[PDB]
Amino acid sequence: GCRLHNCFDYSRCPLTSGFPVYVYDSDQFVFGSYLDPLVKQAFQATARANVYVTENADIACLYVILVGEMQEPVVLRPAELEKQLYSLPHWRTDGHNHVIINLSRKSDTQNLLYNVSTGRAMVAQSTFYTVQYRPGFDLVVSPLVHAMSEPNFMEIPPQVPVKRKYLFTFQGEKDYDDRIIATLKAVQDSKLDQVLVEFTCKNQPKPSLPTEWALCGEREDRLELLKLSTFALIITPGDPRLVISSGCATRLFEALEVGAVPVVLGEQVQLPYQDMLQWNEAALVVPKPRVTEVHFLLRSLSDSDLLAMRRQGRFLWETYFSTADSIFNTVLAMIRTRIQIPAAPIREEAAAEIPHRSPPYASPRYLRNFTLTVTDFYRSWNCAPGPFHLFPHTPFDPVLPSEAKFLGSGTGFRPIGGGAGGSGKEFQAALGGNVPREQFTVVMLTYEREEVLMNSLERLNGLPYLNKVVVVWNSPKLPSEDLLWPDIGVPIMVVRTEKNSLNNRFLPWNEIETEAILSIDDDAHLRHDEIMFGFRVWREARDRIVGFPGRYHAWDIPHQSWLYNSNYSCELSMVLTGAAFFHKYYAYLYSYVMPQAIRDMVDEYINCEDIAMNFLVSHITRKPPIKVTSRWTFRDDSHFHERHKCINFFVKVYGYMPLLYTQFRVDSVLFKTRLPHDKTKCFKFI
Amino acid sequence: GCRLHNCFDYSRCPLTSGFPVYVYDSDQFVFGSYLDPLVKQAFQATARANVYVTENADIACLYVILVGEMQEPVVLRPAELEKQLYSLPHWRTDGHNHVIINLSRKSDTQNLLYNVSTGRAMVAQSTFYTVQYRPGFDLVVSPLVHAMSEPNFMEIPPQVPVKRKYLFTFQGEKDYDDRIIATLKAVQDSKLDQVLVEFTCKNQPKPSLPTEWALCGEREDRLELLKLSTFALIITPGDPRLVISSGCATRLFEALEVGAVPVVLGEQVQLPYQDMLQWNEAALVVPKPRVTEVHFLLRSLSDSDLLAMRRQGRFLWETYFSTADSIFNTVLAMIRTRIQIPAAPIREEAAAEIPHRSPPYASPRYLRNFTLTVTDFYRSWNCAPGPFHLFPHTPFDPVLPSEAKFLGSGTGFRPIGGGAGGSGKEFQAALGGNVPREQFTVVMLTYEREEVLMNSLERLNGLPYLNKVVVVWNSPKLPSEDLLWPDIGVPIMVVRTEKNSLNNRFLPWNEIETEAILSIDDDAHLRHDEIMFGFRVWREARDRIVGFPGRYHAWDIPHQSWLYNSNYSCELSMVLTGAAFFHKYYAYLYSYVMPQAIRDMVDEYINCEDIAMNFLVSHITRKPPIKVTSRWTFRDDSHFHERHKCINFFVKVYGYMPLLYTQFRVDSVLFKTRLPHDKTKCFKFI
């Protein structure tokens, strides 16, 4: 009967004190010796490395104890388990602010807590009965599969082609049941489209609950078939008291792992994390009575919608199901969100500044703590990257309307002509636009090119809105002390790198105090006017990459593969970061959230960092980049083919090609315009 | 105990037979004479005009009976009401597929169905007890306030300024209660920010439930205060059995009506339509224990987030709460969505073609029926326009990735150079891009300018992707029969108009068989190359307005009002439809969904139609338009000031200024580029 408003203590959790968590060591209790070794090892490992965890049990909001899946047959009796629970050091009489975790790996018929009294503690497991499920208080979590193993993406088939060999498939063994079976057998016999339905397992059926469809064979024997199926069928148990079973969750897990779109029969099912996720975007839920209309309904859906559901299912699996770390973090995030506390800030890249011998306005940070966790609930949980981290800024922050600045919210706004507009004279005196005053920061790599560096740095003398320059010394040896660095009116900071890697230009250096970053090589030539216009455009397009150099990708029909092209073209799909603007948000994503395989390959092949960044941004936004000017050059074969390989490998990772074509570029409004002599152009060469 | 899967009959509702509805006439039953006259009249009126309703009770899925709020004191006894229910003609033994409606207008203490047995019927009312609430089966609806009255927007205060006189306010009269009262009184005494809390009503308190906060005074006496408050406080009843009360719903209604952001104390409350709407985006829900942290939490939020919540609350109120028609449509939409049936198609503007004396590829329609109702649940219900209508196309339809066309989904795609790319030679041979082959349609107004029409029409001879031309004869008298219309290789269709109005260029004429529309005046000069490039850009930006002529809006500090400007400028905020591309979707929205006041003013002032369209599109997308070329002209004072008035009035309607500035235009990639002689430019003058 408990709900979060009456069996949880909020006095231990001020909004401002963080979210400390205490984990009981189960080796110090009777549970440990009977726990499944893999579950225990994985949980201990992930809990050791998590950031919210602490050892000071006096300050913790939340106490975590893993009773887990125990070795079969179960030895402990419910009374013994209950006695152990109430004997815990901090199980104050009723056991408030405790969460009990029971992860399922091997047995789908184990229910430890059915006869146990948990007091006011919360329960997290993959199986439930209505008598023991308390919505809004308890949690439904995915089973632990990849214990001590890597959910590598290499085995996953591509998201394309859309249709596969089989429309839908099923494999199970056990008054709507008979009608369902007859309908599906008829569909198979009709051979309008191929299907494969089996109601008897040749491999000895796995143990199951009394009225549940049993799994056939091993995990691999099921995946080898799901890989060929467009839709995956999931029939819920006939028992009305069975809210959710580990078997159905296992089927859902397996289906999402290989891109088969779940189709669920039964509206009364509680899916994992359902109070946070919109499973309608990733799965189809159909009532059993409508079973006779499923074939037509599936045939009706278009390729684009199905592909979108497959993509979203991939995201959900990779983010909440793949690993034990993900599951534990998700549990903590759910509990934190319910009690309305913000997430932990993400880590910066603290750096060592190399000394050398020769107003800045900083952007305010962390202004939307509550809003992201609560108001942006849907975007936070159902859109990439996810809810686990808190960022100082985001490019998706809402922008005030025009009347706001003139009516009370004008802090930092610099209107053109005081709100009256104007030509270049008024245009160049103020940024204008839809967001407040802002600056940008420059980031430049260097490797064995010392003198050109000094000249290029000198070329930056006089930029209006420059905050500072960050030089990334990517060479093994320190710069010579005879080297006299110039002065350009703003600080120049040199940061040392552990080792040479192109991934160091996208690190979130602590020295960067601006949302915007101008990624520029040490040998590139750019005029002041170009940079100003690019900065303004970025201020209008914070979520995009805004850069001068352009490229495009092409199809190779003979080999059914992609290519990297650099010719002059009427359409583009990439903008290299050798000269480009982007938000620091993507630096965090690249460094920490993006898959490690891409970074490792970039280290291996010292090329291909910009391509990865374009892949990332197009994946997040689904919008192409922006090109700003007519210039194409700003001054080998292996370097060329390495990039073909890079593109193909990145596609293999993401599962699809996220790049998008654009057939236009952006120039100033009054560009090449015959003005009257009462007006002046915004720029002279733009 | 009923749920939709066991006390509802799906055999009456094939997915393909529509959603017929039968309404019982309550004048033919004992309810009618005791019903509140206003409720009865409004419900009968709206049910008469609705589209799903039918008179053939044999085919209906759903039978609707209004028991409504009865005159006080209630005369009927529960047994009498129950006997009348079971005596209904189509109340087959258990009364399945029936929904019972009880709208509250005047009394917040009336509960008719507490002692009644409704069988398998669903119940829609604003009050519930846990013993009689069946989640997923019953419905919680808003009270009926604006009965026989217009919810005109003129009385609503502006969304800006953000902060108002009072941070939050409360007015009510009646163990967390005492702590809440003490905390709020302390906050008022601390005068960090102004507030106004009253726990005793000077006006005689309205009757209420045993443990509910009573309303003070009349409706207007509360609005006159809410208009001055940034946040509106809502304290839930102390009775755990009381799920939702008409009083709390009334407070929520009043708060949303005037832009005060609700703040709700208590997580156990069921808000109206909560299973469909994300109230977190419009209201703050805080547990009572956290009452001591509310002041700080409110002070923490930023202006932009608060303004966004206010805007979303405005949308929700206007779309689901304002009128009885909205409530009835919402009820039907909820029930239809639950049983997974698509909505009714929206109506076209059937037109009469005027005859006259002198390959087209049509876009397929209605391809996402199921997807919109189910998969796009969140966007459909929480984003404008809403779920009530079904559109043949939308600009928000997902687009396939690049590899899809080459791997099985290539139907209609025309890659540039067969996927290898290329310069102008390959560029002009195929549309390319990210979406399939497509055409466009031209729409041209005419009024007493016959000859210029013929010349301009002749200028269209030879356009590549033109489907047809639609001429809107906006003159009172028919064209002369001596007039010989030219031939341009495609049909020319002349449609008669009931009366002269600029709103006729945005009507969804049945003759238009393309998503794209080129709105062009009869006296404008445009070159073929320009139109082609604009069409390509629109293909990349289907959700925007893409046009050549540009304008911008300006602030008038002395008068604190807006202005319409047409000078040469470095930044823009509007693109006139005298030459522009847009999606037919917005034509439907303009004609039918957009407020009538704007259309009436456009009829009154024969100017100002384009401004309204820009307002609409920027409101929907929150993104500015696009300008395509350097040209500014394509060849009085009252015409000028009329537009100032139009802008100010439209702002008054929407409650805010939705226009956004853009500081750039788009040109072709290879524009003004020094190519080598192995390449050719995409266009010659673009």
Ligand SMILES: *[C@@H]1O[C@H](CO)[C@@H](O[C@@H]2O[C@H](CO)[C@@H](O[C@@H]3O[C@H](CO)[C@@H](O)[C@H](O[C@H]4O[C@H](CO)[C@@H](O)[C@H](O)[C@@H]4O)[C@@H]3O)[C@H](O)[C@H]2NC(C)=O)[C@H](O)[C@H]1NC(C)=O
């Ligand atoms: C400018 O445009 C031209 C014309 O498109 C372009 O030349 C093209 O380059 C590509 C890439 O080298 C050529 O296609 C390759 O041809 C070789 C055989 O000659 C194949 O081995 C290649 O396939 C390999 O790589 C694939 C991955 O990229 C693998 O999947 C595959 O299994 C092979 O390992 C690939 O087919 C193409 O033939 C030429 N075209 C012409 C007309 O020469 C040029 O590169 C562009 N840029 C510049 C700067 O010129």
Ligand SMILES: *[C@@H]1O[C@H](CO)[C@@H](O[C@@H]2O[C@H](CO)[C@@H](O[C@@H]3O[C@H](CO)[C@@H](O)[C@H](O[C@H]4O[C@H](CO)[C@@H](O)[C@H](O)[C@@H]4O)[C@@H]3O)[C@H](O)[C@H]2NC(C)=O)[C@H](O)[C@H]1NC(C)=O
């Ligand atoms: C090009 O730019 C120039 C310079 O901005 C611009 O001229 C400006 O026009 C506006 C509009 O006429 C002027 O502002 C008005 O001034 C009159 C008094 O002269 C006021 O009455 C106006 O206010 C009325 O209208 C408001 C709504 O628009 C109401 O809220 C108010 O209560 C009044 O009823 C308004 O302030 C402005 O003074 C001039 N500026 C100059 C320097 O002349 C011109 O229109 C632009 N376009 C073209 C084609 O030239």
Ligand SMILES: *[C@@H]1O[C@H](CO)[C@@H](O[C@@H]2O[C@H](CO)[C@@H](O)[C@H](O)[C@H]2NC(C)=O)[C@H](O)[C@H]1NC(C)=O
């Ligand atoms: C939003 O959250 C961030 C991070 O949790 C808060 O920033 C921290 O604030 C504490 C207390 O002021 C400092 O001791 C830390 O050093 C800050 N961390 C960083 C990375 O700056 C921030 O104060 C919160 N803002 C609110 C609640 O308005």
Ligand SMILES: *[C@@H]1O[C@H](CO)[C@@H](O[C@@H]2O[C@H](CO)[C@@H](O)[C@H](O)[C@H]2NC(C)=O)[C@H](O)[C@H]1NC(C)=O
């Ligand atoms: C999607 O819904 C639309 C509208 O409800 C369907 O279009 C109607 O289809 C029926 C039967 O084929 C025709 O009699 C009507 O004339 C159609 N209306 C219009 C406006 O074209 C469409 O068939 C549905 N598509 C599906 C279910 O795939």
Ligand SMILES: O=c1ccn([C@@H]2O[C@H](COP(=O)(O)OP(=O)(O)O)[C@@H](O)[C@H]2O)c(=O)[nH]1
């Ligand atoms: O092993 C390397 C090679 C290059 N770079 C940096 O990568 C950028 C691009 O180098 P380069 O101009 O030589 O490549 P290109 O632009 O000529 O293709 C420069 O900032 C180099 O300092 C680096 O850090 N390590």
Ligand SMILES: O=c1ccn([C@@H]2O[C@H](COP(=O)(O)OP(=O)(O)O)[C@@H](O)[C@H]2O)c(=O)[nH]1
């Ligand atoms: O009472 C009117 C005035 C104009 N128009 C139409 O509106 C467009 C714009 O008219 P006009 O070119 O005269 O306005 P301008 O472009 O000169 O400002 C043309 O298609 C006219 O036929 C109309 O239908 N009714």
Ligand SMILES: [Mn+2]
């Ligand atoms: Mn270089």
Ligand SMILES: [Mn+2]
């Ligand atoms: Mn004209």
